[PDB]
Amino acid sequence: GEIQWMRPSKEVGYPIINAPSKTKLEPSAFHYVFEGVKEPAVLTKNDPRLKTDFEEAIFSKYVSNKITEVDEYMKEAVDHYAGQLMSLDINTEQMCLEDAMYGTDGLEALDLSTSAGYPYVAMGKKKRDILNKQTRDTKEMQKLLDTYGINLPLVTYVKDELRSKTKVEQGKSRLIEASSLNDSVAMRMAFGNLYAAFHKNPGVITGSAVGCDPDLFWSKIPVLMEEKLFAFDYTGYDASLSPAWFEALKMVLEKIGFGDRVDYIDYLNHSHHLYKNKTYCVKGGMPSGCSGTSIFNSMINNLIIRTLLLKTYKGIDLDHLKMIAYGDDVIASYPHEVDASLLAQSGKDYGLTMTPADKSATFETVTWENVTFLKRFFRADEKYPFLIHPVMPMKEIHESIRWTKDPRNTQDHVRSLCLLAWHNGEEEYNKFLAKIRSVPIGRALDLPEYSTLYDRWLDSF
């Protein structure tokens, strides 16, 4: 990820974008009943809590490109992984516009709330104006695809989410590059079946966990894993991807019968953006708000791990590599132990910043007792050990519950948190409910009791 040039949108014939100046996050009914050190992210240059410059901070995520081309290791990584994906026998056909828009088995319908992108965000035209979940009309879109084509700029928003005290004072706010509806729709027709295959097959064959149900999936993971687990964290993964990874991705796509439309990847790779009154071209780096971002990040992560293993451990048997990635987050295993610290060093060769798994000071052995995936620990059930609980630390939940974007969505936001919470144990869950019910709002909510959640869970297998 590296900016090639940047300048006023007017110079290249583009208008200005009105990204909202105020956060939607405000203290919830539970703000003072729970403990949390997070605050809404910095959105504009004006925020009094800023210590260092704002503009610089947000864009500093674009490092540079350490590699240009695809080497021998990467090529073999491509072969191996492409080889696995073929066993799924994925439908290489294109997906009709209807499904691409309003869903189908394996793919949810377009998110009616998220940004519509250029040129719509500049005409004041929203998504609710182009779609009907009941009419399932496509004449609207169809006309718009003919009118503004594809390959449109990515409108760039500052993400409205909670952040640590440090990251707020250093303006370390994350960016959302939202693709135009046209691009999103197009890509969905182009790769819909691929996405669906992935969602319907979370595991070690896809090497993906996208679209999984952790309550159920956790019990499968251990079985799918080889004897020795290894993991690490990435720093600014999306932005650190060099154009070469995208090439390898195209190679994979091409090998699985999608060669036909690998150009779409070029669009993600060598991207064109709009932010406020500026416009910039970016070389490398996966844009965050695009159709397929997760899946593609996950696919690349598969290639990354393989590449590093080939480089670092010549002779390795990739067929005995069991990994599951969700974007940059990953859980992997091998019959023999591996040294993540080595892999991290080889990582830098490919422009990758790999650090000890879960902010650990130094690389330590990964065990079922200390490993996390999607922020969750794995804890065998006390009564039925063959069933595994996805355990989200309470800290995370406490943080989340203290804020709110919409007072009407409180019922669901709390309800959601419970589905996460109860895995921490009955004593823990009850304390949580106790705290919730200490305030008028939380008392008027409709939440499930521990035993209820636990039974529904057992019944679910």
Swiss-Prot record:
Cofactor or coenzyme needed: Mg(2+)
Co-factor remark: Binds 2 magnesium ions that constitute a dinuclear catalytic metal center. The magnesium ions are not prebound but only present for catalysis. Requires the presence of 3CDpro or 3CPro.
Binding sites annotated in the UniProt record for Mg(2+) 1: D233, D328
Catalytic activity: RNA(n) + a ribonucleoside 5'-triphosphate = RNA(n+1) + diphosphate
Cytoplasmic side: 1-461
Location(s), subcellular: Host cytoplasmic vesicle membrane
Superkingdom classification of source: Viruses
Topology of the protein relative to the lipid bilayer: Peripheral membrane protein
Binding sites annotated in the UniProt record for Mg(2+) 2: D233, D328
Subunit record text: Interacts with Viral protein genome-linked and with protein 3CD.
Protein name from the UniProt record: RNA-directed RNA polymerase
Species name: Poliovirus type 1 (strain Mahoney)
First-to-last residue of the parent protein present: 1749 to 2209 of 2209
